[PDB]
Design an enzyme around this catalytic site. Structure first.
Site, PDB file in Angstrom:
ATOM      1  N   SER A 167      -2.528 -13.136   2.407  1.00 45.78           N
ATOM      2  CA  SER A 167      -2.545 -12.938   0.947  1.00 45.78           C
ATOM      3  C   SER A 167      -1.245 -13.399   0.284  1.00 45.78           C
ATOM      4  CB  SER A 167      -2.877 -11.490   0.573  1.00 45.78           C
ATOM      5  OG  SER A 167      -1.910 -10.589   1.082  1.00 45.78           O
ATOM      6  N   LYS A 177       0.816  -1.209   0.000  1.00 40.92           N
ATOM      7  CA  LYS A 177       0.000   0.000   0.000  1.00 40.92           C
ATOM      8  C   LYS A 177       0.854   1.265   0.000  1.00 40.92           C
ATOM      9  CE  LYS A 177      -3.813  -1.879  -0.563  1.00 40.92           C
ATOM     10  NZ  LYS A 177      -3.552  -3.345  -0.545  1.00 40.92           N
TER      11      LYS A 177
HETATM   12  C1  LIG Z   1      -3.353  -4.253  -1.373  1.00 40.38           C
HETATM   13  C2  LIG Z   1      -3.162  -5.628  -0.894  1.00 40.38           C
HETATM   14  C3  LIG Z   1      -3.258  -6.765  -1.841  1.00 40.38           C
HETATM   15  C4  LIG Z   1      -3.563  -6.561  -3.312  1.00 40.38           C
HETATM   16  O1  LIG Z   1      -2.928  -5.381  -3.844  1.00 40.38           O
HETATM   17  P1  LIG Z   1      -3.708  -4.478  -4.938  1.00 40.38           P
HETATM   18  O2  LIG Z   1      -2.633  -3.658  -5.612  1.00 40.38           O
HETATM   19  O3  LIG Z   1      -4.665  -3.622  -4.133  1.00 40.38           O
HETATM   20  O4  LIG Z   1      -4.373  -5.498  -5.840  1.00 40.38           O
HETATM   21  C5  LIG Z   1      -3.067  -8.044  -1.338  1.00 40.38           C
HETATM   22  N1  LIG Z   1      -2.799  -8.280  -0.042  1.00 40.38           N
HETATM   23  C6  LIG Z   1      -2.679  -7.324   0.907  1.00 40.38           C
HETATM   24  C7  LIG Z   1      -2.371  -7.696   2.337  1.00 40.38           C
HETATM   25  C8  LIG Z   1      -2.856  -5.905   0.534  1.00 40.38           C
HETATM   26  O5  LIG Z   1      -2.742  -4.920   1.468  1.00 40.38           O
END
Ligand SMILES: *Cc1c(COP(=O)(O)O)cnc(C)c1O
Ligand SMILES: *Cc1c(COP(=O)(O)O)cnc(C)c1O
Lengths: 318, 312
Positions: free
Chosen positions: A269, A46
């Site tokens: 993620s 982010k």
């Molecule tokens: C933002 C984010 C994603 C995906 O990134 P994008 O650029 O918004 O698609 C995946 N996992 C986490 C923990 C994130 O903060």
């Protein structure tokens, strides 16, 4: 002299690292490396959009620290990125969120001096968004970042993330594997690298329980950071070659394995991203091919999230 | 291709950043910049010693991942760094700590797959050390890192931390301000830079209620990461020019200010370091001088530990 003006000049330029145990244990034929977005100043991808969305809006003359109140609905890492950026650059910032959001994340936002306004837990992100809209209408000069619609989100990934991947692999990257949140990361990388290397493939990742990009229905899932249950405006859907779905448990288990077998503490993620990258690398047609997979965040934030969540769960039983 | 073999190769090389609000608001005459050790892979200065103590021992032919069980009596950032390193390099790792340890740091250690051996609360750190010795003596080949005694601790700071400060400031650095935990950071920096620039000054930081380097008595305090209540073997007290003492509340307040006024979320020891640096920078004789201040950790860890003890 190598002295940064402020923390916002320290985002990105994240390293690639090879995986030494997991892909081998899984009989992978493709080569998997991880891009460590956990090494950004506030420990997530982010930080790139928190800084750039504000820089972009400043450079266009839309916003100013002495006058602009920043507003954004956010239950994830974007809030932290914006809070850091706002504190570094001298902006007042209001973030809206559901009450369901972890206490740890609330303390993080408050620690950076952000103003928080809570919304009903049953109304989800939908109530937070509506409340955020009111606040902008209420305040003259106020500005909404709109992370899902803002063109400077994929732009920063074009200008930095994509170039880092291109340079660090010296043109050798064959795949990006990336979970889709706003879709900014995978989009920026896809736009730049596909234009230089038409053979380069783009693999999106999403929760099994919320398989919207695959054409299924939105649903509740536990893969924090990805799968918002709609298709974001900034996502270049035309550039995606494949969507792989990952269960909550798969994503968690591969997160555990990243920590214990690779020394890479990562959010869930990251575990989702790896899981999908593993499946991809096992395919015979992909032997010897270089797969870049994103680690969107360092895993300490997620760990305390799980800890506060467990405490609340035990006290809410019976 | 620029791809690291593993995470232990991504340690150090942390940036300097100037402060734009705090020293200006405090009427500072010297110039304060922060070195962001919070940007190490596991978010603290420790990552340097966790990796290097193991690396040094490998090159000496003392340890191997296939046969060596690593052991250290530590609850804190060194534990986290060793756990990351052990996981990355394939080592079995046992950490001992009193049973009175914060569950966040226990959870972190388990997240990396370290084996935890808890010791009675009444015994304090001494109980953890004694149990660690017993585990070592019981396992053939087992190896204790001994962070407070291990010469490779100050070594890594000589070879990386000091070089980064020297190079990044193009030799202009006038002061290092660092709180003493093991004292490795300040020692490594002092050794290299005083050798190159005799006018360079070394300012140590310790807690007000444990002013041991100043020559006082050990006592309790809330500045996590510094002030162990003794002088560590690896600390080179001869190379320190001044000791500044900081209170719990001063450290905490300057930590808050780093977060809100600079966007630099930092542990309490960063607040203590900055507090001392401010006083230093307010002195007329230091006008225009370049003061490098250690931020030993990103502040998420500490904030998290605070909230859990607000429930405990
Ligand atoms: C933002 C984010 C994603 C995906 O990134 P994008 O650029 O918004 O698609 C995946 N996992 C986490 C923990 C994130 O903060
Ligand atoms: C290690 C540490 C220090 C001091 O570093 P040494 O090199 O051990 O003197 C200060 N604060 C925190 C949070 C630490 O982890």
């Amino acid at each position: 002299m190598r002295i940064a003006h402020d923390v916002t000049e320290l985002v990105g330029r994240t390293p690639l690292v090879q995986l030494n145990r997991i892909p081998q244990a899984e009989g992978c034929l493709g080569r998997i490396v991880m891009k460590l977005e956990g090494m950004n100043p506030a420990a997530s991808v982010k930080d790139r959009i928190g800084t750039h969305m504000i820089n972009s809006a400043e450079k266009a003359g839309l916003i100013n620290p002495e006058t602009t109140v920043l507003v954004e609905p956010t239950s994830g890492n974007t809030g932290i990125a914006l809070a850091m950026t706002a504190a570094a650059k001298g902006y007042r910032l209001i973030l809206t969120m559901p009450e369901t959001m972890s206490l740890e994340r609330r303390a993080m936002l408050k620690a950076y001096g952000a103003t928080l306004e809570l919304t009903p837990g049953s109304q989800g992100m939908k109530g937070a968004i509506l409340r955020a809209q009111q606040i902008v209408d209420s305040i003259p000069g106020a500005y909404m970042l709109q992370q899902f619609r803002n063109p400077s989100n994929p732009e920063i990934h074009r200008l930095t993330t994509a170039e880092e991947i291109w340079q660090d692999t010296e043109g050798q990257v064959d795949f990006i594997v990336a979970g889709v949140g706003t879709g900014g990361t995978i989009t920026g990388v896809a736009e730049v690298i596909k234009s230089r290397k038409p053979s380069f493939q783009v693999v999106a990742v999403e929760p099994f329980n919320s398989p919207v990009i695959s054409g299924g229905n939105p649903g509740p899932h536990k893969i924090q950071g990805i799968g918002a249950g709609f298709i974001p405006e900034v996502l270049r859907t035309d550039l995606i070659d494949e969507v792989i779905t990952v269960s909550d448990e798969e994503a968690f288990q591969f997160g555990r394995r990243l920590a214990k077998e690779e020394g890479l503490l990562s959010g869930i993620s990251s575990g989702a991203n790896l899981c999908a990258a593993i499946q991809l690398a096992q395919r015979p047609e992909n032997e010897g091919k270089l797969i870049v997979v994103i680690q969107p965040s360092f895993g300490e934030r997620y760990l305390s999230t799980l800890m506060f969540q467990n405490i609340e769960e035990r006290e809410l039983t019976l």
